Write a protein that binds this ligand. Sequence first.
Ligand code: HEM
Length: 246
Amino acid sequence: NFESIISHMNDHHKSNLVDLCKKFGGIEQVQVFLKSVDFNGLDLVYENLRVEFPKKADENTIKDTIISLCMSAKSEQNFSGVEKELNEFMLSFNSVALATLNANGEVVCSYAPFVSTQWGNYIYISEVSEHFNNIKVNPNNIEIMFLEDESKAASVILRKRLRYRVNASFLERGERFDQIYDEFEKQTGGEGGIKTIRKMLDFHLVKLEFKKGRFVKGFGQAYDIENGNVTHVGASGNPHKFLHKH
Ligand code: HEM
């Protein structure tokens, strides 16, 4: 079963088993081979290093999980096909998590419906909610998070996420409201009481202005955003601290 890849990995690219020790062990210098694999990860030697898989594989997937485990350990960010992946990610949602602050400096964690359009990014919120006055009062101390669903994530310790600091502006109704909200209805498909809250006057559309961003798509895969300024963290070394000690 596995001995065919154990062979192939050991007779070709231990150069990638080398990048592997340096990132799942932190080992800044050695001079490697593969001794066993299973459906939860690898066992290798530089000297035992146990390297886990983001998600448990099976006979059909195991070949690919290992190449993915290797390409991420590669010390070179790929194309900003991460810019493309970041935006594909944002567009899969029509709701977002919010961090807001009230009149007396207490922080609030809430969520709000969200839509990206030609005219910009909006949320739709009611004055009945705490985060409303937190935004009327502190309109540029907000951060929003697009957080991957737990049931879709590799594990609860690796939910993909996209975070922006934002600047919020209140729109009023009429011309654009109907433009934005009809696009919101387009993306969401319309139903669920979405039509009903459109006609609630205690609800408002708020334009969000994205500032500094942060995207995490996997272990060792955190990126920053500014002004086309995608950026891996990160190259100044593995920031974590292992014992290498039992
Ligand atoms: C065994 C490999 C790794 C594992 C299992 C791992 C796991 C994690 C986890 C669970 C977090 C979230 C911590 C939190 O939210 O409090 C995190 C954060 C982070 N890690 Fe790693 N990591 C690994 C390797 C690396 C490497 C190689 C780098 C640098 C290239 C790195 C850089 C970072 C950065 C920059 C963050 C902050 C992300 C954020 O703002 O949420 N990690 N890591």
